[model samples]
Target: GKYFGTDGVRGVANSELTPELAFKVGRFGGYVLTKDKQRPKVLIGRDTRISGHMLEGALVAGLLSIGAEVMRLGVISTPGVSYLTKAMDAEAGVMISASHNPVQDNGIKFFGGDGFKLSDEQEAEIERLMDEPEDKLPRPVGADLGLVNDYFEGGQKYLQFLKQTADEDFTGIHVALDCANGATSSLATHLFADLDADVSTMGTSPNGLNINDGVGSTHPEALSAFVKEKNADLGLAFDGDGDRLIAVDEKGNIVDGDQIMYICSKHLKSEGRLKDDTVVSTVMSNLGFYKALEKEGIKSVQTAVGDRYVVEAMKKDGYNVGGEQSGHLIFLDYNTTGDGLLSAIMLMNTLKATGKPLSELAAEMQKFPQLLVNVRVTDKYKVEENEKVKAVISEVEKEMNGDGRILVRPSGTEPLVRVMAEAKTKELCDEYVNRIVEVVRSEMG
Candidate 1:
């Protein structure tokens, strides 16, 4: 539990997440995940971060130490590994990345043969083994030792799969891409070009350090300008690991995950493809998102902050469409985890099918100006129920008269209470959020 986070075990490379720990995780995780099979197979993939190579070497060594037949997928996206692991019938899969985090940070996440993240019991088992006293894991003899193989073609296989999910080709559409200079650098262009779209590109070169530097979904403004300069139909920007997508309309307007999901929900429902006529999102979704979905006669479900929770909810209820506001969308009909390329293709397919520009489609949902203030507190959890904090939130909510929303929750990874307010205007959001934050600080500080 100490080593694993919502997605996986992440920290600064070679420091907090040291090479030694990676070795143990691979060894223990391989043993736990593949103990039943005679010759267990494991797939490994990484992003373009410089430390990816170092972590991969350590992780592969650990996997091999326990006789895991390791197939290395060089410099691929997070979802690429998820899809290939299941398609190849591997016992488990490992991805070395930190998503949108900087190059200095890296992570290692595991997937079962079914292509889903390991359950809580499995992660705890691996963590327990890591903290054990001795190195009692299997160290096979010369013949039993695991072997490694190159599976670079796995990336193309993934791309081919993504290309088919679209109903038709994007022949007349002009698409612009910002690959974040990471996993999608090579894959995005090929996929778009294969779909017959007129493509323009930026952020395609990864020099190790430049990955996610002033680019990617986290900085959609860069892609916004790029889209307008190229005079492209729309722009799609992916995070460092290529699991998230944020798009830009032809008018240079940023279209976030909420808008994308709303757009896709409308299209899917039109084609009788939307499961239960519902869309799943996180509590952090914009107030406008819920209103738009409600207006469209679609059911809405809210989960916690992480994409993992979104996927879990989807799987439990058989819901096919879900994601977060940060662009981590999960279309379970296509892939297990968030697939940025798939989302882009789906959006493009909708545009072509509807014969409408992206700006028009995205315009259906008007996003409200939202502001969030994080208050550091000695007891963050108690802030939610604190009398003063609750009173202030209710007061703000009553004043907004149903035109706004307020969310007061503890941060998932930090000791802070995030007080957020959304209203018709930025100044109102700021004023409302500040009122609650002050009360939170005074009551819990």
Candidate 2:
């Protein structure tokens, strides 16, 4: 698990994430997952990064050397690989996209037969083999060597499955789509068009290095404007790997994962499909989301950050809905992991069923105006130890009473402190957030 993060092993392609590492991952991870079966089937997919080409080659060779049958699913999403891995009854699935990361970075994420990402133990086993000096894994020869086959149609198959998940055609609705120029560039448009939706698309052109440059879920404003320009009913912006979705309502307002979850959960409750009346979210979800859910009598489990943890909570508690504010959504009743296309279709279906505009459905939860400031510091750890920082936060909380919230934490991968606040208005959010920012900058910058 040393190389793997919440998603998978990722780094600057050809530099940190060399093809050798990918090969070893395929050899070790595939071996660990399918050591029991002869010519065990393994499916591989990738995003649009050019490094994916190098990594995919090495990874496939390693899988073939280990006598694992490999199916090349060219340029597809992470969730598509997960779905095909389980649906095709493959032993394992590997996706070669660094979800939401820059085009310079690439990754290899594995999934088991159940269509879920790798278990911690499985990741650990792969890491152990990777860290080991001598490569003692299987290397079959001649006829014993596994075969590689082209499954370009796998992407089409995946799209077919997505089409079936929608309850009705989007004949009358116009949807603006930003595909992140990654995996869904080809898939999303086809899926929506197949359902008769009038689609206005952007970020659908992938040029090896442009994925997630200035579009996608990381920049919902692009789609917001696109929606407004097209007069679309809603807009869907997907991350680089198509696993996350940040939506824009018809009025160019963003409908994030929290609001989408709230709307979907409410609809499920109406249809008598909500299990235990519960939804799962991460701690980063807006306070307004919880308040709105509570008002509607829908229970929610808030877990630590990461969509995996949100999925963990849902599985542990039998909740059918879970997601993070970053647009990683899981509809347990549909796909196992976060799926941008699936979420979009389901949201559209909900919109259709209720005859409500995206604004109205999303407005069911009034999102708090929030501000986040990342402070680059010489020592991010010092912010946590400084008492003045804590005192300022406490003072701000006292001033705002119960109508505001603050979160100050170290960045997961950088030497920076992230200060975030939420309040009823932008001005209040700015005041509290800036008050904390000054302290952090003074203490650690």
Off by over 4 Å in 2: 371-402, 409-420, 427-445
Task: Say which candidate scores most in TM-score.
Answer: 1
| Cα lDDT listed for each candidate | 0.89, 0.88
Which portions of model 1 show Cα errors greater than 4 Å? Answer: 372-392, 399-401, 408-419, 426-445
TM-score of 1: 0.91
**Candidate 2 minimal-lDDT segment of 10 residues:** 27-36
lDDT of 1 by residue, 1-445 (tens): 4888886899999989888888888888888876568568999999998988888988889888888889999999989989998998888889998888888999999888888897778888898888878987778989899988888999999999998897998898889999999999999999999989899999999988889998999988899999889899999999998999999999999999999999998999999999999999998788889989989999999998987788888989999899998898989987899989989888987899999899999999989888878888887877657667678778889899988998877888988878778898999988898888777768666
The residue-by-residue lDDT of candidate 2 on 186-303, one tens digit each, is 9999999999988899999998899998899997878888888888899999999999999998899888888888888898888888899998888888889988998999988889
TM-score for all models, in order of appearance: 0.91, 0.90
State each candidate's clash count.
Answer: 0, 0
